[PDB]
């Protein structure tokens, strides 16, 4: 019983974190086998970032200008190359703490854990979701760049995010582990801005099933609705439209609570139009959307 | 930027989690050097927890009856004893992943990270607080017993909680690592229930200071209050009485922001009596109470771990 914003255990990732320094700029790198991955803008100064040319900058660097450090110990860089917005550094020794891993690109609406680091040292872990506009609402002070986001399935770490930038509104932007940005952002100081965000409807519905599972059910009602009718209301409140695929995905939770998906949709429709009237659900006075259906099933069953 | 509730990196604790089994009863244990700690009620298999004389069952149990598992490896139990509500198992191997650690008993209101575990394997990590009524609002399923709560200071792991049980309201009760329960609770089948709880005033104030530190300061006003007048109001909203000791604890955040504690109390008084008017504080619609003053300093000034 109970329900918490829960992160994956971060141990397997902790053992891969390192420090990468170029002149006066230091950030975090990810050390897997004999390769260290970090954001390429490690080779920039605060002034280089106005309009950097990374090809220009990188050619003026040698293996020797990169200072990589695992805790106290320096690692010898014997190769370097760029892969999109990532720098790859080869080191002359392999990380024995390297876990079973893959690099995955996630979709908006999906969640993952972040291991915030500074100077190659793990500081904290938290769970978040990839907003529909491709930003993350993160907790990232300066020097956190290079920190990674991940999921764990069985004994395998799926890396899905590396932190690169903070945007004018205070939200965060980054890449997958191939250096490709989520969203239309770039690694330079531009007036770039995130699109208007939306509420992840599928996740809200999952969260309401979690509430019902934990005994919170005042918001339920006798009505049912059609998908079309629900979408017309949801979209008026800046909620993502719901699809049949998304209804199908809520199936197990529906079965577990014996509340039909379209009945739960009718409940949400009423909450949207009426408000909560000070009341709370699972302790919150607003509808939460950073839990996926699988997250709910995992925690509640 | 951005502000979020964060757990400590759990790696150093993951390396200490094992599986402890007696008969059909399996739960989690904490493996430090050559000792494994787990809830004593693991010997109840699948025995009614009505009125068991743990002493007796324990005197009857053999070393070979405990199945301890660390990964694919079965640890050989070579000794066993009881320490209050905990079982201590001596094994033939000192845990190679033992970090620097200490056992501490925490105060109500204090926060910690919990590594939820099942069958000895870590499944998830979250941050929570010891409620004033001596329970935690955790997230636990069956088989989570033995999961631990902890803080990390530099390179030292301070273990402060081991999970024992769930109460009728869905909240949770457990012990420190000496095996002494938080609250009046016991590890047997009884009519025990959580008492009425309160909002951790010290933490809300710390959180308001965090907001200001982060440039979120709309709720500040130009008035002040006495401690007594603050308590008269706040206690009507089910807040814990604030003491002079709490006021002093907030001192460093008061100094950093230049806002006297009683001045911040007046803003909170105004927030309680008037609501927020749909506005947010640190992106939150409710007054957060699971961040301590030290949590705020740590996250805003610094801070990493070895």
**Can you list the domains of chain B with their CATH numbers?**
1-14+100-197 (2.40.10.10), 15-99 (2.40.10.10), 198-301 (1.10.1840.10)
Judged by DSSP in three states, A203 sits in helix
Segment (H or E) for A178 = none
Sign of CA dihedral A293, A294, A296, A297: positive
The H or E element containing residue A75 is strand A73-75
Contact between B226 and B234 under an 8 Å Cβ cutoff? The reply is no
Closest C-alpha to A11, from B161, B294, B7, B146 = B7
Write the burial class of residue A235 (CB in 10 Å: 0-12 exposed, 13-18 middle, 19+ buried): middle
From B63's Cα to the closest Cα of chain A, the distance in A is 31
Q: Are A32 and A16 in contact (CB under 8 A)?
A: yes
CA distances from B157 to B43, B87, B162 (A): 28, 21, 14
> A2, B285: Cβ pair inside 8 Å?
no
Between the CA atoms of A117, A105, A45 and A81, what dihedral angle is there, to the nearest 10 degrees? 110
Question: Are the Cβ atoms of A6 and B116 closer than 8 angstroms?
Answer: yes
Q: Distance between CA A5 and CA A126 in Å, rounded?
A: 8
Whole-Å CA distances, A224 to A207, A221, A294, B219: 19, 8, 24, 42
3-state DSSP assignment of residue A263: helix
Residues B297 and B153: their CA atoms lie apart, in Å, by 13
Quick check: B9 and A14 CB within 8 A? Answer: yes
CB B8 within 8 A of CB B30: no
Looking at the DSSP assignment, which residues form a beta bridge with residue B132? none
**How many alpha carbons lie under 13 Å from residue B251 in its C-beta half-sphere?**
5
Do residues A136 and A110 make contact, with C-beta atoms less than 8 angstroms apart?
A: no
Give one DSSP letter per residue of A47-70, joined into a string: TGGGS--HHHHHHT--GGGEEEEE
Name chain B contacts of A7, Cβ cutoff 8 Å: 7, 124-126
* Angle, CA A167 vertex, CA A165 and CA A173 arms, to 5°: 45
- Phi first, then psi, for residue B19 (nearest 5°) are -105, 130
Query: Cβ of A286: how many Cβ atoms within 10 Å?
Result: 14
Distance CA B288, CA B298 (A): 17
How far off is chain A from B259, nearest CA to CA, in Å? Answer: 23
DSSP letters spanning B253-276: HHHHHT--HHHHHHHHHHHHHH--
B98-131 exposure pattern, b = at least 16 Cβ within 10 A, e = fewer: bbebeebebebbbbbbbbbbbebbbbbbbbbbbb
Q: What is the CA radius of gyration of chain B?
A: 22
Q: Which residues of B touch A (CB under 8 A)?
A: 1-12, 14-15, 115-116, 122-126, 128, 137-141, 166, 170-172, 283, 285-286, 299, 302-306
Tell me the C-alpha distance between B130 and A227, whole Å.
43
8-state DSSP, A182:
S
Closest CA to A94 of A37, A40, A10, A36: A36
**CB < 8 Å to A168, chain B:** none
Report d(CA B191, CA B281) in Å as an integer. Answer: 40
């Amino acid at each position: 019983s109970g329900f918490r914003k829960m992160a994956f255990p971060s141990g397997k990732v902790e053992g891969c974190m390192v420090q990468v320094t170029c002149g006066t700029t230091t950030l975090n790198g990810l050390w897997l086998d004999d390769t260290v991955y970090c954001p390429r803008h490690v080779i920039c100064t605060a002034e280089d970032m106005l309009n950097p040319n990374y090809e220009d900058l990188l050619i003026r660097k040698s293996n020797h200008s990169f200072l990589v450090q695992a805790g106290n110990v320096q690692l010898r860089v014997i190769g370097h190359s760029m892969q999109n917005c990532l720098l790859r550094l080869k080191v002359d020794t392999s990380n024995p703490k390297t876990p079973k891993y893959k690099f995955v690109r996630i979709q908006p609406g999906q969640t993952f854990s972040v291991l915030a680091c500074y100077n190659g040292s793990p500081s904290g872990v938290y769970q978040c979701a990839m907003r529909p506009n491709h930003t993350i609402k993160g907790s990232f002070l300066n020097g956190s760049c290079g920190s990674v986001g991940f999921n764990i399935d069985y004994d395998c770490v799926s890396f899905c995010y590396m932190h690169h930038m903070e945007l004018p509104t205070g939200v965060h932007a980054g890449t997958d582990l191939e250096g490709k940005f989520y969203g239309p952002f770039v690694d330079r100081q531009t007036a770039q801005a995130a699109g208007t965000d939306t509420t992840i409807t599928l996740n809200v519905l999952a969260w309401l099933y979690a509430a019902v599972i934990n005994g919170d059910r005042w918001f339920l009602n006798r009505f049912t609705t059609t998908l079309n009718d629900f979408n017309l209301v949801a979209m008026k409140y800046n909620y993502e439209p719901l699809t049949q695929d998304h209804v199908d995905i809520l199936g197990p939770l529906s079965a577990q609570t014996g509340i039909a998906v379209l009945d739960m949709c009718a409940a949400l429709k009423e909450l949207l139009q009426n408000g909560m009237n000070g009341r709370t659900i699972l302790g919150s006075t607003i509808l939460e959307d950073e839990f996926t259906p699988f997250d709910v099933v995992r925690q509640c069953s």
